[PDB]
Amino acid sequence: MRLNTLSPAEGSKKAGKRLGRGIGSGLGKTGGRGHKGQKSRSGGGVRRGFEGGQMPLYRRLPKFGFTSRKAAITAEIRLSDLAKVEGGVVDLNTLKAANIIGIQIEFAKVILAGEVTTPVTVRGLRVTKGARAAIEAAGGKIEE
Amino acid sequence: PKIKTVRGAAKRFKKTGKGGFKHKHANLRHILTKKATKRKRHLRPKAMVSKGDLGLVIACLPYA
Amino acid sequence: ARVKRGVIARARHKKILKQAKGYYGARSRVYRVAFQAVIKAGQYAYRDRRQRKRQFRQLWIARINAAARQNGISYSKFINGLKKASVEIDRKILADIAVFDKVAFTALVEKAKAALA
Amino acid sequence: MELVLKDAQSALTVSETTFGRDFNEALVHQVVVAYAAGARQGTRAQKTRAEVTGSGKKPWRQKGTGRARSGSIKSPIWRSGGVTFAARPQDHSQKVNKKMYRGALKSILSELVRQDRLIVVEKFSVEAPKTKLLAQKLKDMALEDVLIITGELDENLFLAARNLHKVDVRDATGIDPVSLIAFDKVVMTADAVKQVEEMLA
RNA sequence: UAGCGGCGAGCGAACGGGGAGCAGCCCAGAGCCUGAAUCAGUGUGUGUGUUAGUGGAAGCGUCUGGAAAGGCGCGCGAUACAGGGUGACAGCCCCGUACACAAAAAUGCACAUGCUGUGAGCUCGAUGAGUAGGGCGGGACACGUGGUAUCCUGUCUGAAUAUGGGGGGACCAUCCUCCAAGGCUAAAUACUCCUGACUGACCGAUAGUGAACCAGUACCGUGAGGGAAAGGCGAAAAGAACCCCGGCGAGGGGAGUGAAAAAGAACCUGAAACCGUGUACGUACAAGCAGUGGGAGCACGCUUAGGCGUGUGACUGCGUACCUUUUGUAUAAUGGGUCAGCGACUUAUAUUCUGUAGCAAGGUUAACCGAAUAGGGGAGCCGAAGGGAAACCGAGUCUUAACU
RNA sequence: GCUUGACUGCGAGCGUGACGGCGCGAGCAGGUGCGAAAGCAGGUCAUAGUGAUCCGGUGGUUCUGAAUGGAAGGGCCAUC
Numbered sequence A: 001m002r003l004n005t006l007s008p009a010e011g012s013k014k015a016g017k018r019l020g021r022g023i024g025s026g027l028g029k030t031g032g033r034g035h036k037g038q039k040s041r042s043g044g045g046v047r048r049g050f051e052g053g054q055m056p057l058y059r060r061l062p063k064f065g066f067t068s069r070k071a072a073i074t075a076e077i078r079l080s081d082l083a084k085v086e087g088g089v090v091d092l093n094t095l096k097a098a099n100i101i102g103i104q105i106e107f108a109k110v111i112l113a114g115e116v117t118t119p120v121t122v123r124g125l126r127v128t129k130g131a132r133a134a135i136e137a138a139g140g141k142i143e144e
Numbered sequence B: 001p002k003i004k005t006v007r008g009a010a011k012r013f014k015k016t017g018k019g020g021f022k023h024k025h026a027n028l029r030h031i032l033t034k035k036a037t038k039r040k041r042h043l044r045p046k047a048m049v050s051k052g053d054l055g056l057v058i059a060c061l062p063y064a
Numbered sequence C: 001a002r003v004k005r006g007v008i009a010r011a012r013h014k015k016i017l018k019q020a021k022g023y024y025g026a027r028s029r030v031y032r033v034a035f036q037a038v039i040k041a042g043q044y045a046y047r048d049r050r051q052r053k054r055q056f057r058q059l060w061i062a063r064i065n066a067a068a069r070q071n072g073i074s075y076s077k078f079i080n081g082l083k084k085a086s087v088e089i090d091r092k093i094l095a096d097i098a099v100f101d102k103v104a105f106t107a108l109v110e111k112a113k114a115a116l117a
Numbered sequence D: 001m002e003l004v005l006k007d008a009q010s011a012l013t014v015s016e017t018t019f020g021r022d023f024n025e026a027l028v029h030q031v032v033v034a035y036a037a038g039a040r041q042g043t044r045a046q047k048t049r050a051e052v053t054g055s056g057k058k059p060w061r062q063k064g065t066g067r068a069r070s071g072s073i074k075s076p077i078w079r080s081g082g083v084t085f086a087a088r089p090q091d092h093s094q095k096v097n098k099k100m101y102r103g104a105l106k107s108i109l110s111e112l113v114r115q116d117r118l119i120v121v122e123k124f125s126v127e128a129p130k131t132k133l134l135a136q137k138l139k140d141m142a143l144e145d146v147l148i149i150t151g152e153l154d155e156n157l158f159l160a161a162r163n164l165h166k167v168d169v170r171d172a173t174g175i176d177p178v179s180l181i182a183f184d185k186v187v188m189t190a191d192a193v194k195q196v197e198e199m200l201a
Numbered sequence E: 001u002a003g004c005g006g007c008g009a010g011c012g013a014a015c016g017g018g019g020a021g022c023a024g025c026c027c028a029g030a031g032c033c034u035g036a037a038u039c040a041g042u043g044u045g046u047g048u049g050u051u052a053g054u055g056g057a058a059g060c061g062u063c064u065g066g067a068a069a070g071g072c073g074c075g076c077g078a079u080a081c082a083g084g085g086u087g088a089c090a091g092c093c094c095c096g097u098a099c100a101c102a103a104a105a106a107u108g109c110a111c112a113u114g115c116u117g118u119g120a121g122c123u124c125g126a127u128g129a130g131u132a133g134g135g136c137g138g139g140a141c142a143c144g145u146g147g148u149a150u151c152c153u154g155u156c157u158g159a160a161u162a163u164g165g166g167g168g169g170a171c172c173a174u175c176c177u178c179c180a181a182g183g184c185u186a187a188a189u190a191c192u193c194c195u196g197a198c199u200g201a202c203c204g205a206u207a208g209u210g211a212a213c214c215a216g217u218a219c220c221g222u223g224a225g226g227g228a229a230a231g232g233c234g235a236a237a238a239g240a241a242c243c244c245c246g247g248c249g250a251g252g253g254g255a256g257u258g259a260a261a262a263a264g265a266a267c268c269u270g271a272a273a274c275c276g277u278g279u280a281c282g283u284a285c286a287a288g289c290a291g292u293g294g295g296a297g298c299a300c301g302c303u304u305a306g307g308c309g310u311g312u313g314a315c316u317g318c319g320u321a322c323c324u325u326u327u328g329u330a331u332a333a334u335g336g337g338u339c340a341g342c343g344a345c346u347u348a349u350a351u352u353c354u355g356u357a358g359c360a361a362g363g364u365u366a367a368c369c370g371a372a373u374a375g376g377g378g379a380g381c382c383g384a385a386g387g388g389a390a391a392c393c394g395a396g397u398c399u400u401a402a403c404u
Numbered sequence F: 001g002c003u004u005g006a007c008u009g010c011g012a013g014c015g016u017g018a019c020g021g022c023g024c025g026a027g028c029a030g031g032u033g034c035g036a037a038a039g040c041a042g043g044u045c046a047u048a049g050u051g052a053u054c055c056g057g058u059g060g061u062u063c064u065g066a067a068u069g070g071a072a073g074g075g076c077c078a079u080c
C-alpha cells in the first residue's frame, strides 16, 4: 500500500469523449453531429416539447384539477414508524419529534404498511381499517 | 441553475405509480351537442401518455 | 496545464518526410505534398502486392508457351497433357526449367504428348 | 484481535473491524484522490475574447478586400486573441461520504497491521524540543521514515520533528488517509490506538 | 413548489424550519431633583499595532571538472531542511529561515483620566391630518386587472381620535393581532485604486497584462479614439592588445582571452520552408498526379565468393492529388503559395441513465460550528404507497346507484 | 298503427393511427318503446356534413374555501 500502488476499480473512471481529434478516434470532423441543419450548429437545437410547429402534446391536451392546500398539511404513517417514537404514545407531536412527519403537518393517517411488534397508543390520528387490526393485534390502543 | 418546469405541462400531466403520466382527453370542452353520448362518455376518464410522447412530457417535467 | 505541440508535431512531420525520400520537388520537401505522396505510395503498394502475383504468372505462362511451341505443342494442350499425366509441377518451376533445362522441359512435353495420345 | 507492543511486551485488545478488515483498494483510492484534490487551491484565469483589452471595431469590411471575414481583434483564432474556453478559479474539492471516509481509514490501518508497518508503544515523547533528541530516539528504535501518532498533542515532540523530513507527528484526532500511507512505518501510542478505535467505532 | 403567464416563451414567491449576528433608543413638555447614564471634539497616561531596525546554529578531506553545491569518506546544527544567490544540484560559503528582541519621532485602536458641549432618574402628561380611506390615470408587489388584498402617487377629494384606528389576499361577521401619517441606531453583509506578508496540479516571450524591454510609447486619425513590434554572449567583459587585405570603410584572415569563439556582440540551443558549393548515379527520340510492382547497369559497402545492404534508376505492367460539398467530382465546382508556432465540443449549476464504490429499508446531510479534508450540525432532500380533480379512503382506490 | 333506444352508466374483444385521436363491438346494470312471442331498438344502408388547446359564459354539484363561519374564486359533471 503506497501512493504509487493505488488504482481505481475497473470501469469506475471511463475516459470522456473528445470530439474533433482525427479519423482514428471515430469522432473526428463533424464530432458525431452529422451533416448541416440546426442540430449541427453551436448553440443549435429546439426547445423541450417543441414538435416542429404542430400544436404540442402539452397544448393539444386540456388542463385538469386543482391543488389542495389540505393535502400539503396531511401526512401518512407506516406501522413501522410507531415503534420509532419515544414513549409508546403516537400523537402529532411525537411523530414530529421522531422526524416521521413534517413540522407543519396538522393531520396524519396510520396505514397498513410495514409491521407493528410493540403495543402502542395512537392519539388524535386517523387509522385505516387494516392498520387498526394490526395495532390492536400487537396489544395497542386507538383514541381520538 | 435549477432546471425550470414547463408550467403549462405541469397543469396537464400527473406522474403515476409505475412512472407513466395521466392526462385529460381532448375534445370535451365545447361543440358538445353534435357529439355522441358514447364518444363523450369514453373521453371523460383520464388516459395514459403514449410511448412516443413520454420523452417530450418527461423533458417538460424534470421534477415530476 | 498549457500544452506546447512543437516536439510531437516535429516528430510527426519528420516521420512522413522520411518516407517521402526520393520523390520529386515538394513531394520530398513540403509536408502537405509529401503526406499525400506517402499515402498514394501505400495505396499502390497494397494494390500491387496482389498485381505482382498476376504479372509473374502471366510471365511464366508466356515463357512456357514459347518453350512448348519450340517442342511442337501449344501452352493450352501442354497444360492439359500434364494435368492428364498427373504432373503437379507449377508455372513458376515450369518457366524456370524452360530457360535453365531445355532437355528436362522437352521430357515434360513428351509426358504431356503421351497423355493426350 | 491483539496488537503486540514493541518494547513493553504487552498486548492491546483492538476492534477486528478497524485493524483486521480486508483491504478495499477502490474505497481507499477514492478517499486518497479526494484528499489530494482537497489540497488544491484552484486560483487561475485566462481572458475570454470579452476580457482581452481592445475595441469592438470590425478589423476590416465584410466583403471586397479578398481577406477572410473578421469581426473581433480578440478572436481566439487570432494571435493576441482571447482563450476559447478561458479558465476561471475553480473548487476541486470532492464530497467523501462520512462512512466511505471511515471505511477507507479502517482499510488503511488493517493493511499497515498486515504489512507489519503499524508499531504500537505505551508512550512516545522527548525530554526537550530538540531535533537531536528525537533523531537519537528514532536511531535507537531502528526508525527513519515514520509517522508518530500520539494520544494528545505533544509540543516538544512536534517541535523536534519539524526539521525531520521523513518524520511527522500527529495527535489521534488529526490523522488523515494520505499520511497513514505516505510513511514507511506508523508508530501509535496506546492512548492513540484507544482514541482511533473510538473514532472509527 | 404555490402562483403569474398571447396560461405561450418565460417569470417565480411566501408561511415555516436550520444558521451568522444580535441592542436598543429619542422627540412630539412641563414640573421635581439638577450637570447623574451615553455620545462627540480634544489634553495626558499606559497597553498594544504600524511607520527604520538588532542578534540569529553548524564542514572539512578526496575525485572529476575551467569552476564543485555533484560522486566518495568521515563530522556537525536543527523550535532553523521556507526560499534565494554563489563558476554544475549547498542544512553547515553568503542573504535568509525558526526563535528571541528594538523606537528619538509621528500615527491607528483600546481602556484609565482631565476639560468644553450634550443630558441621567422620577412623577404627571402628551401620542405625528390635507393624513388614513376614496374616484381617475399609472407604477411597485413572483402576482400581466384578474374574483385581487397590500404598497407608492400625477390628478380630484377626504375620516375617526383607544368607547378609536390598521392588518389577517375580493367582501361581511366573529375572533386574534398590531398601533400609520416624527426621528436615530452597532454587528453579521458588499467591494478593492492602494500597503505589507504569504500561496497556486496558473502563464513562461505568437503564452501571461496592450506593455517582461523608456508602452498607452512608436505609429494612424481633425477628433473622440485606435494602437504594435521588440527578452537570453559569457561564470566573469576576461567585449578580442598586436599584425595583414580593404577606402584611416564595410567585411574578412591571423594573434590573443576563455572550458568553449562548434559563445564575437545580428552573440544559448539553433528545427522547417527556402537558396547554394561538392560527390555518386540517372537524363538531350522523349509524352500525362511523377508513384507503385517488376528490373538491367553504375557507384559504394559486405561477406573472406554466395545471384545480399545502401544510393541511383535505363527499360517495363498498373496508375487522373488532397479537403469540402454532393445522386455523383481527375473534374474546367470549393479551399490551400510553402514552412514553423497558434487555432474550434469547454466550464458552472441542475437533471436523468450507465459503470463503479459505500451503506441499505434506509441513504445522505446544507448553511454553519470547528477540535478545520476529522468531528459536530439530519434544517432538509430522495426512497420504503397508492388511487382520486378533491374531500377522502388506503394495499387498495377511483369510476357508477352498483359493477358481471 | 303505437311510440322516444336520437336512453344513462359501462364494456370482453378488436380495427385504424407517430401522436392527439377516430372507429366497430357482443355482453353487464338501471330505466324505456314496440311485439302474442321468439325478439328488435344506445339514431338514419354504410362511408363526407368538421375545429385541438387557452380564455370566458350558463346550469348542476357528498369536492375546495389563505385565522374561523360564510362568500368570492378554483375543481368536477353537463353545455355554449
Ligand SMILES: [Mg+2]
Pocket (backbone or CB within 6 Å): A016, A017
Ligand atoms: Mg467531459
Ligand SMILES: [Mg+2]
Pocket (backbone or CB within 6 Å): A036
Ligand atoms: Mg461540413
Ligand SMILES: [Mg+2]
Pocket (backbone or CB within 6 Å): A035, A036
Ligand atoms: Mg442536408
Ligand SMILES: [Mg+2]
Pocket (backbone or CB within 6 Å): A033, A034, A035, A036, A037, A039, A040
Ligand atoms: Mg442533422
Ligand SMILES: [Mg+2]
Pocket (backbone or CB within 6 Å): A099
Ligand atoms: Mg425533519
Ligand SMILES: [Mg+2]
Pocket (backbone or CB within 6 Å): B028, B029
Ligand atoms: Mg366543460
Ligand SMILES: [Mg+2]
Pocket (backbone or CB within 6 Å): C028, C029
Ligand atoms: Mg531532405
Ligand SMILES: [Mg+2]
Pocket (backbone or CB within 6 Å): C043
Ligand atoms: Mg488507386
Ligand SMILES: [Mg+2]
Pocket (backbone or CB within 6 Å): D080, D081, D082
Ligand atoms: Mg492573450
Ligand SMILES: [Mg+2]
Pocket (backbone or CB within 6 Å): none
Ligand atoms: Mg463533514
Ligand SMILES: [Mg+2]
Pocket (backbone or CB within 6 Å): none
Ligand atoms: Mg431568481
Ligand SMILES: [Mg+2]
Pocket (backbone or CB within 6 Å): none
Ligand atoms: Mg429563521
Ligand SMILES: [Mg+2]
Pocket (backbone or CB within 6 Å): none
Ligand atoms: Mg445565536
Ligand SMILES: [Mg+2]
Pocket (backbone or CB within 6 Å): E056
Ligand atoms: Mg546565520
Ligand SMILES: [Mg+2]
Pocket (backbone or CB within 6 Å): E088
Ligand atoms: Mg555548466
Ligand SMILES: [Mg+2]
Pocket (backbone or CB within 6 Å): E127
Ligand atoms: Mg401614532
